[PDB]
């Protein structure tokens, strides 16, 4: 509810978003998700939905924790693209995006779809 | 047969028609019901737009120019803006607007109040989703902006989306629908129960093709909502195969007035040919 200030006034969000799920704070909602045949390539990033059978697919600046907080990047890889999140996960899409990185050779989430 | 489209398109019977302006028997709110799991009713709406203008004779240039209005929801983010990144060719150049702050996938976001909205390019695409919460007249505010961008900034051969609802409308846009090779009141299935409907220019001339009256057309499209009641729909939702809009690779030339004949025209009527400049694209304010 309060969940986008909390992590905004944080010194580390991510770590804040982290303890307010774990203190059983809902996680953050109105990630846009997308309508898409499921016979996409299942990688991670893409400039379109590319959801498999086992994904969804999001519109990326709404899965994104610095988009959504209006906050600087650590550095964004996800706005202007579409980001594809384990079914099972599609519950918590900007969490998925924090705890989660994308394989360098095969383009897909570490230890999920990459092999 | 009905259900199965992405929508309905005022008849031409009924856009033919002179009727008086009465009140629209429906309301604007539901608990939809056929928006799928998960799903904003705003993605559901737009991809049944996108849907629509598969079918129509829109111009598609190598470098594309889309302008998207009124694009953030009270959530902060923009869903309807998501579903055109996710229909119009990569490299689009996809630059959206509302008055407040909100979280996009354009390539650029602007915010304030769309009156504040300046450039001096013309676009191929003009998507609008404003809309501001005794009796029923032609409404101003963004809509006197709007017939002004649409004058201004769409490129001949260009089209327009934009939505409208019994008490948000206005009769110089609709007047404006007269400028284009094609135009009609298109209803989304998933949001049939409603007055909104988003009017739709197709092919822009930039001079009148017909004589249309606003009030008129306002009261034609309402007596048409009355009369036909439209069963929600989301069928089309369920098959995205064939979603993203063609790449048609629409030439683009920078024509004097005194070279648009009548060959041109007819190229333009016929979604053939889009005319603007092609500089830099500066929008800002
Ligand atoms: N005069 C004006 N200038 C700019 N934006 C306006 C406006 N009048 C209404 N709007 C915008 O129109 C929107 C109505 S709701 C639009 C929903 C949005 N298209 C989505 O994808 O979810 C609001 O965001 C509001 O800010
Ligand atoms: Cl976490
Ligand atoms: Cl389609
Ligand atoms: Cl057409
Ligand atoms: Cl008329
Ligand atoms: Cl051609
Ligand atoms: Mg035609
Ligand atoms: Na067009
Ligand atoms: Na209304
Ligand atoms: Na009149
Ligand atoms: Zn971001
Ligand atoms: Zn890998």
Redesign the interface.
């Given at each position: 509810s309060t969940v986008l200030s909390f992590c905004a006034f944080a010194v580390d969000p991510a770590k804040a978003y982290k303890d307010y799920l774990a203190s059983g704070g809902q996680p953050i909602?109105?990630?846009?998700?997308?309508?898409?045949?499921h016979?996409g390539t299942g990688q991670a990033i893409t400039?379109?939905?590319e959801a498999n059978m086992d994904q969804?697919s999001f519109?990326?600046?709404?899965c994104?924790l610095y988009?959504?907080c209006?906050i600087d990047h650590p550095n964004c890889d996800l706005?202007?693209?579409?980001v594809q999140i384990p079914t099972t996960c599609?519950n918590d899409p900007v969490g998925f995006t924090l705890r989660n990185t994308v394989c360098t050779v095969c383009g897909m989430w570490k230890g999920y779809g990459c092999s | 047969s009905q259900a199965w489209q992405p929508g309905v398109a005022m008849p031409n019977l009924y856009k033919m028609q002179r009727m008086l302006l009465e009140k629209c028997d429906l309301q604007n709110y539901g608990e939809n019901a056929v928006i799928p799991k998960g799903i904003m009713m705003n993605v559901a709406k737009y991809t049944q737009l996108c849907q629509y203008l598969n079918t129509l004779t829109l111009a598609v240039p190598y470098n594309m120019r889309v302008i998207h209005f009124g694009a953030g929801s009270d959530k902060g983010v923009a869903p309807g803006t998501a579903v055109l990144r996710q229909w119009l060719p990569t490299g689009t150049l996809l630059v959206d607007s509302d008055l407040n702050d909100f979280v996009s996938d354009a390539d650029s976001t602007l915010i304030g109040d769309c009156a504040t909205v300046h450039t001096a390019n013309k676009w191929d695409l003009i998507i609008s989703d404003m809309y501001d919460p005794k009796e029923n007249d032609s409404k101003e505010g963004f809509f006197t902006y709007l017939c002004g961008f649409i004058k201004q900034k769409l490129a001949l051969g260009g089209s327009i989306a934009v939505k409208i609802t019994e008490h948000s409308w206005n009769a110089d846009l609709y007047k404006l629908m007269g400028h284009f090779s094609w135009w009609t009141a298109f209803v989304t299935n998933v949001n049939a129960s409603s007055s909104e409907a988003f009017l739709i220019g197709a092919n822009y001339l930039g001079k009148p093709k017909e004589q249309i009256d606003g009030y008129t057309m306002h009261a034609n499209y309402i007596f048409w909502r009355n009369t036909n009641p439209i069963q929600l729909s989301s069928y089309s939702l369920f098959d995205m195969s064939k979603f993203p809009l063609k790449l048609r690779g629409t030439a683009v030339m920078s024509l004097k007035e005194n070279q648009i004949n009548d060959m041109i025209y007819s190229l333009l009527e016929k979604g053939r040919l889009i005319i603007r400049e092609n500089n830099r694209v500066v929008v800002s304010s």
């Amino acid at each position: 509810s309060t969940v986008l200030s909390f992590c905004a006034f944080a010194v580390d969000p991510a770590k804040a978003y982290k303890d307010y799920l774990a203190s059983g704070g809902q996680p953050i909602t109105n990630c846009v998700k997308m309508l898409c045949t499921h016979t996409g390539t299942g990688q991670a990033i893409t400039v379109t939905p590319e959801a498999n059978m086992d994904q969804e697919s999001f519109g990326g600046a709404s899965c994104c924790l610095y988009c959504r907080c209006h906050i600087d990047h650590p550095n964004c890889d996800l706005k202007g693209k579409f980001v594809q999140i384990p079914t099972t996960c599609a519950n918590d899409p900007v969490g998925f995006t924090l705890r989660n990185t994308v394989c360098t050779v095969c383009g897909m989430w570490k230890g999920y779809g990459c092999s | 047969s009905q259900a199965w489209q992405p929508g309905v398109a005022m008849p031409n019977l009924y856009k033919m028609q002179r009727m008086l302006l009465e009140k629209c028997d429906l309301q604007n709110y539901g608990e939809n019901a056929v928006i799928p799991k998960g799903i904003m009713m705003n993605v559901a709406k737009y991809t049944q737009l996108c849907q629509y203008l598969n079918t129509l004779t829109l111009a598609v240039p190598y470098n594309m120019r889309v302008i998207h209005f009124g694009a953030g929801s009270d959530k902060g983010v923009a869903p309807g803006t998501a579903v055109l990144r996710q229909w119009l060719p990569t490299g689009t150049l996809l630059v959206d607007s509302d008055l407040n702050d909100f979280v996009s996938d354009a390539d650029s976001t602007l915010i304030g109040d769309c009156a504040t909205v300046h450039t001096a390019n013309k676009w191929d695409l003009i998507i609008s989703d404003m809309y501001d919460p005794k009796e029923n007249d032609s409404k101003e505010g963004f809509f006197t902006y709007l017939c002004g961008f649409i004058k201004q900034k769409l490129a001949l051969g260009g089209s327009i989306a934009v939505k409208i609802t019994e008490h948000s409308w206005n009769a110089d846009l609709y007047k404006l629908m007269g400028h284009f090779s094609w135009w009609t009141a298109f209803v989304t299935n998933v949001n049939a129960s409603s007055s909104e409907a988003f009017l739709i220019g197709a092919n822009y001339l930039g001079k009148p093709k017909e004589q249309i009256d606003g009030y008129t057309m306002h009261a034609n499209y309402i007596f048409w909502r009355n009369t036909n009641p439209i069963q929600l729909s989301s069928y089309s939702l369920f098959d995205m195969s064939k979603f993203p809009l063609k790449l048609r690779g629409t030439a683009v030339m920078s024509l004097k007035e005194n070279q648009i004949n009548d060959m041109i025209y007819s190229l333009l009527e016929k979604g053939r040919l889009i005319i603007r400049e092609n500089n830099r694209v500066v929008v800002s304010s």
